[PDB]
Amino acid sequence: MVVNIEVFTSPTCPYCPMAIEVVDEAKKEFGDKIDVEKIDIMVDREKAIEYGLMAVPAIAINGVVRFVGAPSREELFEAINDEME
Fold first, then answer.
1. Where is the Glutaredoxin domain?
2. Superfamily of domain 1-85
């Protein structure tokens, strides 16, 4: 896939759809198409599936799975690039 980001933090707050725009910019150069996905802590609490203990601000790593990340949106930018790479 070209761009693939999943930001799972919360619907009442700003997930992490920012570091993805950067990955989209570069992944667009390659994949003119984009696929950045963004979920809330109440719909994608699967993020923590790994621990599901402290699962609130995180993102799925469109490439492998999902991780813990609140103000760590950039992490998504690296996951899309480590997803396609």
1. 2-85
2. Glutaredoxin (3.40.30.10)
